[PDB]
Ligand binder design. Sequence first.
Ligand SMILES: Nc1ncnc2c1ncn2[C@@H]1O[C@H](COP(=O)(O)OP(=O)(O)NP(=O)(O)O)[C@@H](O)[C@H]1O
Length: 422
Amino acid sequence: KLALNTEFKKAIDLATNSSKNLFITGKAGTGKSTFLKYLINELLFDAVVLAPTGVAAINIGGETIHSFFNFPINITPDKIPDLFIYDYEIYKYVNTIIIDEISMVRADLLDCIDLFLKRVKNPKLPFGGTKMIFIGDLYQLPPVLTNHQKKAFNMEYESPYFFSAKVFKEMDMEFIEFETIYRQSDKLFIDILNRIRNNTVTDEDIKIINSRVQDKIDNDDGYIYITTVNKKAEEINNQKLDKLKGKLYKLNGTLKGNFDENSLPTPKNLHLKIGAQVMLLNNAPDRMWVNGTIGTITNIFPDEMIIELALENGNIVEITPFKWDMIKFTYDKKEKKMLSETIGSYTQFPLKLAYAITVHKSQGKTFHKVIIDTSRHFFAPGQFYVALSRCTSLDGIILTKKITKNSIILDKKVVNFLTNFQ
Ligand SMILES: Nc1ncnc2c1ncn2[C@@H]1O[C@H](COP(=O)(O)OP(=O)(O)NP(=O)(O)O)[C@@H](O)[C@H]1O
């Protein structure tokens, strides 16, 4: 039911017929998710799909990288050879292994997959000779810190980011980018995002971005506070909910089978009040709401199990609990095949308090009106770009504090690596 872009048909050809080592990239919202959705279902295809984190795998209907390869948490590329492989026969059946949100996987973690695949498969070809499709826009790099949040492995890695994987320097994968925009296609905003990606920001860009700074906000309704501090975001949602009048409703999620309670999209104990600012987590088929749409609860119906909210201006919708599937790829020793099957179900309203969110937890979502916490002196490499990528237009963006071109410093380091990808 979707249009096939000229770069969409180029990517499905190189992946479904001339399948060899492809890399889908682009900007935030350019079609990479629907391209992967169109490959697995609504098309004749079979392949494993992996994601770095458990919550990422639940959204795309895949399974964790560590879960698929039975990797321990402490796995390093040096522990791969001294790692006893059971169920060795099953790995010779998997081809075209697709990884999603590739920018989020570590450098060492990606080389573990190569060395693991080289064991169960041809030991000379990269990744054991399996077709590697990587998706997830390239400039959504995870945040790093110098004193905090390190493991500092410096054996041969220039950086913990994905591109520093040694498998790349001995591989050819003919990268393909998705450059077509949508969804509040603010061109001036898009071009500023392009120059931040290119690290070619002009002084007029900084003047335009700083024009969105506001120390005061009248009618903050509809705005979501995007910060980096996981602590601060939780305080804002809870404080905003206490200041709301009305009965507190406690809705409980049904956890069937074997599901990871540490990867729940929305809390099992959902505390909501009529009037709360909530966020939809379901990306509806009829395009009424996307994953990240902000609404306001207008009524709660516990008996009928229906939560009513006006989606913005007046787009009133009725929401029922949604079911998430826990996908696990298993080798059927009887039918000799791999096709994926659910091991657990989590059912709960696709809703979450949306007064504030963190950059890490807002992955994949785009909002309409954001309040970005730019009180930090510096932004970790590529962390300002990901904050702006969570919004759809410059008119929706509000900055708490004015930034300078020195704030986007340490982007210079990574951009010289990302340009090497040719
Ligand atoms: N080729 C296309 N033709 C028509 N509509 C499209 C196309 N690609 C994307 N869209 C629309 O734009 C939305 C964004 O694409 P989507 O595949 O969801 O990427 P995303 O998850 O929003 N973020 P990203 O993976 O960075 O692109 C989709 O939900 C569609 O509504």
